[model samples]
Target: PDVIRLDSMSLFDTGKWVLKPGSTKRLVSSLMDIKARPGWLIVVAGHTDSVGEEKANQLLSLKRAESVRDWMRDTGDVPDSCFAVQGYGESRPIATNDTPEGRALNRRVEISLVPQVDAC
Candidate 1:
């Protein structure tokens, strides 16, 4: 299976974890592509803006990840068993926290497609 990366940068308002309507097209497209490939598992991971407290950020990040997971399951028609959600909070940043744009860019969710692995 091929791993596809889909960013949730456009999914939310600046410095927030709300899903934007415009992001659905891209997200659905990515998921549809993954769905075409059998035995593929999607990993939904969330990150956050660095302006918040670490603990709050962690929780928010997970919430954001779950938000995406729910959207994919409900709207994208993806099965729950085929997907996993996680939150890294501010642990993995794509950009520096020095600027507003950088922080905004850092706050996002990433969907990765991987081969289904055994849980046990």
Candidate 2:
């Protein structure tokens, strides 16, 4: 599987799911990378920091993942059926939540491309 990770802080505003300006470039780059890998299934997973309530974080993460899926579908010409969206919320943190930098790293979106299998 091929993976592309994007920081939520760089793509969105604090506590918001909306994509920030200049975020399109990053998305486009990832899209192109995925496009290069033909016959691969795309998965978009969203993660959040530990500061938010559990329920809110889950919802926010899912929303963020959907937002990225929507953008890729509309702008990158990717089909909706091609994406599998998941939200990890605060359950899977890549960094400690004790510092702002750590939290920033925790909040992220990961895109994975897995090769498809065919029946012989």
Candidate 3:
């Protein structure tokens, strides 16, 4: 499947990790098909732009990734073993942090599905 890069501009607030309201619908909608496949490993990686302390960004990134994973686990009753999550912090920027447009793209949750022998 194609990697889904969801920009976190309105998905989350500055210095916050919670998915407010609107974003959840899109996630469940986009991710439902892949989640049902038994051999597909769901990967959700969180990221952030370089605007604050590195540690803070790292922590927020982890929690932010878990927010989506957990939401799916709780609401969708998906098995925890089928999913893998990571927080890349500001280290894996997709664009320069110098511009607002780039920063927005850098701060995103990248979703991918990998088919493996023992997944799910």
Candidate 4:
């Protein structure tokens, strides 16, 4: 089967790792798609805006990534082994952190799906 790349965004309500209520649908769908596959691996990368200290941003990023991983395993029915989570603080900026909209876009969780590979 062909591999699929799903880059879905998950937003936090405030200075927290919790997902906003309106963002649940996209998350649910992402997980459901993972569950339907025979075997798949997902990379949950977390990003944050350049507002807080670097250490705090790193911590928050890790927390956000882990939160998404937990949701997928606990709620999405995906096995823990199927997901790899990472927190890339303010190192990666999709948009400049100079504006509110850019900051909003920066503070997000991205999900990347990779199908299983067979040995030769």
Candidate 2 structure quality by residue, lDDT tens digits, 1-120: 435443333365558788767787788888887677655667788878889698899988888888888988898888777788899888988789898888877766778775653211
Q: Evaluate residue 34 in candidate 2 and report its C-alpha lDDT on the 0 to 100 scale.
A: 65
Each candidate structure's TM-score, on Cα atoms with residue i matched to residue i, is: 0.82, 0.82, 0.77, 0.83
TM-score: model 4 vs. ground truth: 0.83
Root-mean-square deviation per candidate: 2.7, 3.4, 3.1, 3.0
Query: How high is the lDDT of residue 3 in model 4?
Result: 71
What digit string (tens of lDDT, one per residue) describes model 4 on residues 27-50?
877777676664567878888988
Clashing pairs in 1: none
> lDDT by residue for model 1 over 9-74, one digit each (tens)?
536555567786677676777667667665567778889877778888888888888888788778
Residue pairs with backbone overlap in model 4? none
What's the CA error at residue 31 for candidate 2, in Å? 0.8
Count clashing pairs, candidate 2. Answer: 0
**TM-score of candidate 3 against the unseen true structure:** 0.77
Q: Point out where model 4 deviates above 4 Å.
A: 1-3, 116-120
Q: How close to the true structure is residue 39 of candidate 1, measured as C-alpha lDDT?
A: 57
> How would you order the candidates by lDDT, starting with the best?
4, 2, 1, 3
Per-candidate Cα lDDT values, in order, are: 0.74, 0.75, 0.72, 0.78
What does candidate 3's lDDT look like per residue over 27-109, in tens digits?
77646765557556777788888999999999888887888888777887777886788888888887898988787667667
Clashing pairs in 3: none
